[PDB]
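user: can you give me the structure for this one chain? tokens are fine.
assistant: on it. calling the predictor now.
[tool input]
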Amino acid sequence: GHMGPGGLDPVEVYESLPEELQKCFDVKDVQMLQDAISKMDPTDAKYHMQRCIDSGLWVPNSKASEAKEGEEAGPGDPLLEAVPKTGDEKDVSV
């Protein structure tokens, strides 16, 4: 009914990742990816994983799809200036 948040693309996340991350995905080596996180911070790791899940770019194990919760904001598309463009008002019988 209200679609707004949780709208990230797979390509955006992939391109928004470090050469190491992009190279890790190429080798479909999930094990190697998990290792990289063990070295990185906890907060940073959660952000990276959240992006992959929200972007459906990677499927890390099961029981973890469509990340819920999280601070929302909105889609971003009011569409309104100061005059009614037009609609299906019809010319009444035509």
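assistant: here you go. The CA atoms of residues 1 and 75 lie 13 Å apart. The first helix runs from residue 10 to 15.
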